Design a protein around this ligand. Sequence first.
Ligand SMILES: CC(C)=CCC/C(C)=C/CC[C@H](C)CCOP(=O)(O)OP(=O)(O)O
Ligand SMILES: CC(C)=CCC/C(C)=C/CC[C@H](C)CCOP(=O)(O)OP(=O)(O)O
Ligand SMILES: [Mg+2]
Ligand SMILES: [Mg+2]
Ligand SMILES: [Mg+2]
Ligand SMILES: [Mg+2]
Ligand SMILES: [Mg+2]
Ligand SMILES: [Mg+2]
Lengths: 307, 303
Amino acid sequence: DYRARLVYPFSGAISPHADIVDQATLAWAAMFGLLTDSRHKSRRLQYGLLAARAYPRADREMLQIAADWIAWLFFMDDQCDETGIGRDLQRMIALHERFLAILDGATPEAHDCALTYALADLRRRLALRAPDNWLRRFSEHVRLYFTANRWETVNRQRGATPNVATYCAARLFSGAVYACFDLIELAEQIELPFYARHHSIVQQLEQAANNIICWCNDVLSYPKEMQHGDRHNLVLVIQGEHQCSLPEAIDRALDLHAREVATFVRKRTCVPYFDAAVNTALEKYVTGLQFWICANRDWSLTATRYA
Amino acid sequence: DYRARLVYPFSGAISPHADIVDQATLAWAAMFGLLTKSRRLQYGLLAARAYPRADREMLQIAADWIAWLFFMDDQCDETGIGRDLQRMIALHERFLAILDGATPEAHDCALTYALADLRRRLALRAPDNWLRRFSEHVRLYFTANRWETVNRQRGATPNVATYCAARLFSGAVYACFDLIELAEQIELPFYARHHSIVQQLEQAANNIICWCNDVLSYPKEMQHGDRHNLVLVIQGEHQCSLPEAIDRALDLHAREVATFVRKRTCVPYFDAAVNTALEKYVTGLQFWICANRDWSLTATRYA
Ligand SMILES: CC(C)=CCC/C(C)=C/CC[C@H](C)CCOP(=O)(O)OP(=O)(O)O
Ligand SMILES: CC(C)=CCC/C(C)=C/CC[C@H](C)CCOP(=O)(O)OP(=O)(O)O
Ligand SMILES: [Mg+2]
Ligand SMILES: [Mg+2]
Ligand SMILES: [Mg+2]
Ligand SMILES: [Mg+2]
Ligand SMILES: [Mg+2]
Ligand SMILES: [Mg+2]
């Protein structure tokens, strides 16, 4: 049982609003027409129960935006990774031109699809809770996620599996984890000054947490990705580069995950002293990264998505 | 004296267009009424060293941009607006409008018009993703300058950790690093452009350029009573002599040079085309490190 090795020297938490938020996410999906034919299965999506773990101290209104955003990501992701649009760059470019217009604050038009309308709704709701500087940073992380998904599409279309270095570098954006990390600021109601927000050690803590979450997901989701012939997965990329067995590739992936956990724990104590207020806010942010690491693992072990 | 210790284990270069670009930067600065000894500014001779392989058209934008920063910088560091937050917020609101695409209005100042001209010219050479990354770095430069202004007004000195973190943005070096992509005509994929090792190389090069400037510019900054300088921040934190503060700043500079050349050997292998483009970008960081030092030692600005 290789899944037993996905362990951390810290624990997570869940918002008491978890089930209320999950039911509201299903109602939001229905409202914006994101629930496709494939009804009874929708009851066990449980996207709100991941959000509830990722932002456990958030007010219900803010948690609901995070939950709806996570739902959006899964709906978009399953299109990219399991349907035709993921093998069609020109279709994806056309869609992303609409998303990018909506991220700049353009109102959707009659011809726009459900996902564009739903994105516009999330941007509108975030604009009410967040200042302009935050909105710009979130939008750029979402833009980089679109860029990364266009890159994954070209790989699928050309039948090309990236090397480990390229995959790991791209994975940091293809999973939209940085955009989710931006929501921690709103969940914790913290205003980090520019010099603290972008500090090298904070960036390295963000990178480590992102790698941990993505590589944990890669170990839990290689089976379903193999079924669809999509090798955007640390296990499958390691297998191709090292020409090794699947058990060996899984073992190597878990070793990289364990090393990245140790790196995160180590760098947590390398945060320099700015002032009392800034460091208090900074420790709430870094605590947020730990909640996310645990949320991903705790939710993913209990989800039929990876069964 | 202590200036002799500002050394690098690599060399720079200068564009053959250096003098016509510098002369054209003066002409541009006069045209926009940014001039009010002009021939001794030599802002084009910094640009020519920073982007030595750039085509003349692209180098001219870079030179005009560097001139813009110096004009803006002297107003912040030697003039009243640098000790007036609400006035700076008003000016920055006009700049941020221009950066988003808004055309200047009747009673916008010379700088706002000059910034709009630079944005227009950059839009002809660079795609939207580039313009956004550049705009964000310039926005963080404005934010860093507003932070410096609050410090000046309250007569506050930040600790070394706070100053170094803020200095990375107050110098606009990242905005200048963005221009390397255009100078060198390279298109780095997202995953290489934002790679942790590339970020750490940019941070090291930024630290080196800023701390080199701090050692060469502490005299003129003391005269204006400005403490945004590694030497002066070290002196305040450690309560040491000025010679000891300079020695400590130069040790941090030397240590950062060692870090930069070490992390150059830690760049992963992505593919042939990407690593070819990356090595041109990282070489660009080296050109900038050398350009800053080479230009500053011959500039009357720090005499
Ligand atoms: C769906 C999405 C992009 C984000 C949802 C929120 C989130 C940050 C989840 C953590 C897991 C991981 C980063 C998803 C990566 O996509 P991948 O396609 O490998 O996910 P899958 O294995 O579940 O399909
Ligand atoms: C003027 C400016 C923002 C940039 C021009 C181009 C550039 C990146 C020059 C390198 C020197 C340094 C980063 C300037 C920092 O401002 P500081 O105020 O310490 O400069 P000074 O010492 O020359 O006054
Ligand atoms: Mg997927
Ligand atoms: Mg995916
Ligand atoms: Mg997966
Ligand atoms: Mg200055
Ligand atoms: Mg300055
Ligand atoms: Mg200076």
